[PDB]
């Protein structure tokens, strides 16, 4: 009554079957990566087949490519001898074994929590190599031990995903106010901004309520209200990639020493912002279109690893500038069945 995903190998016909492409991330624990393999004997002695899960992290900037260096680290590597020529079976594994036959051999992994979610940095038009970001791979090798070089004639590769979804609890609603005292004696000026809630589903409008009470003789020239996205990187001491993904330079002149309150709407979306290379987007299987990065939440007690993406609405007032940052989180709701992992209409 269900379906799985299958990949094959030329020499050994090592048919790797996986229950799902993605694996949701509860903060306490990650859903298990459970699957099976059909391993027809294409040998007489090479009776070992190994399954390796690798949470690779690749990175490289424009000037890094110009100089000729790009970093890549294996955050987590797991090797299991799935064929006993341990790991008690599961329901889906049992159903697959009943379908498959005797040669079906299970393999089960668990991803330790707080590992970074599958987030890929958007490549530029010139960028054509392996995509930069956090990508999870499951591979199968038909060899003996690990002394033999991993031969492409036998290996099987599949790209999996680890993602998070918005919690039911909204959390504290973001809100921030700042009053600046100008150089003319101590004359204040108050700015306040508030959001609708803390978790926003991708594409939903953001109704930032902004109110300014100027206790001065000056005038507000313009109001730049933007949605900045910060993609911190926790390896090789790389800087914090900051990038505005939505904007509105709404100009409004307000009477000196007076009040003015209203709401400004901003919506992040990939249509207007498809050029800013290095932007963090959700996991791409094979260069497919994906939304922005799902804002990771380290609710556990935690360790900074991988790419930590977050979003904050920054409101700036000109004359220097009064700036206020309201952090929040952009993430999908809980899907019913699963994401299609591709554009829903293919072509």
């Amino acid at each position, epitope marked *: 009554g269900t379906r799985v995903f299958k990949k094959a190998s030329p020499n050994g016909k090592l048919t790797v079957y996986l229950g799902k492409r993605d694996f949701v991330d509860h903060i306490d624990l990650v859903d298990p990566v459970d699957g099976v393999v059909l391993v027809d004997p294409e040998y007489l002695k090479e009776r070992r087949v190994y399954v390796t899960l690798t949470v690779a992290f690749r990175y490289g900037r424009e000037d890094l490519d110009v100089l000729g260096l790009t970093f890549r680290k294996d955050l987590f590597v797991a090797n299991v001898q799935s064929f006993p020529p341990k790991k008690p079976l599961t329901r889906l594994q049992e159903r697959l074994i009943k379908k498959l036959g005797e040669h079906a051999y299970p393999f089960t992994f668990e991803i330790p929590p707080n590992l970074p979610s599958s987030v890929t940095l958007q490549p530029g038009p010139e960028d054509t190599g392996k995509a930069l970001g956090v990508d999870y791979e499951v591979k199968a090798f038909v060899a003996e031990n690990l002394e033999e070089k991993i031969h492409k004639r036998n290996s099987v590769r599949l790209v999996i995903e680890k993602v998070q979804y918005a919690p039911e609890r909204p959390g504290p609603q973001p809100t921030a106010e700042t009053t600046r005292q100008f150089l003319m004696s101590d004359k204040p000026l108050h700015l306040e901004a508030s959001l609708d809630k803390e978790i926003y589903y*991708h594409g939903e409008p953001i109704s930032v309520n902004v109110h300014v009470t100027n206790n001065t003789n000056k005038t507000v020239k313009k109001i730049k209200i933007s949605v900045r996205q910060y993609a911190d990187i926790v390896l090789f001491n790389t800087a914090q990639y900051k990038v505005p993904v939505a904007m509105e330079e709404a100009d409004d002149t307000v009477a000196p020493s007076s009040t003015f309150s209203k709401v400004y709407t901003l919506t992040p979306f990939l*249509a207007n912002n498809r050029e800013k290379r290095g932007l963090a987007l959700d996991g791409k299987l094979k260069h497919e279109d994906t939304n922005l990065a799902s804002s990771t939440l380290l609710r556990e007690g935690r360790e900074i690893l991988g790419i930590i993406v977050s979003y904050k609405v920054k409101v700036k007032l000109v004359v220097s500038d009064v700036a206020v940052e309201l952090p929040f989180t952009l993430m999908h709701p809980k899907p019913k069945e699963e994401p299609p992992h591709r554009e829903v209409p293919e*072509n």
Partner: single-chain antibody
Amino acid sequence: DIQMTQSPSSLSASVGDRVTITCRASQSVSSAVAWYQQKPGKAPKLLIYSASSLYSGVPSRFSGSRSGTDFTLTISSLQPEDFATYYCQQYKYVPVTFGQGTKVEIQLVESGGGLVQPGGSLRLSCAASGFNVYSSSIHWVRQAPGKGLEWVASISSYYGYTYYADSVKGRFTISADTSKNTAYLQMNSLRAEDTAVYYCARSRQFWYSGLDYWGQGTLVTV
């Protein structure tokens, strides 16, 4: 494209029958199928999406089944309320070619149409209330008088994608005006080539759980 053979194309019976409607695809679509139902003078309402994932707001009589490349809709008890023309939408690939369309026998606002000159251009406005154009995907679907439903236009604002059928490529301009949270379709054609009734429709932007909401529509009669 991919064709949807819907055998049988005409099933009429009394109440209480477990009527089964099959739907065959020329190419594999991998459990990406939707089924609708519409009444005379009424826009359709989705019943099944994504291969037997029952849509909220309809009874549990209806069900689906991905039998190889064939998909089946089943009504256990043919209640008197279930007397409508049914269809078989597929959405795995582009276009969104529908099915044959079988009958059974015993706040979107689309405006800016009416009786049309033999040739020229028209503007059809779909005022979409209840969602943001970035959080939804706005489609436009036509039906000739007493004929099947065919996808006409589509806009996906979040990705900034504009889509039209291969047979209408260049003859329609779909746009998403976020100022009024509305959609606009500009037609530049002539004669009774496309004289029909046109429905605006909305779909969940991201995972596309079928075209959930449909407008009243108007008669574009040349």
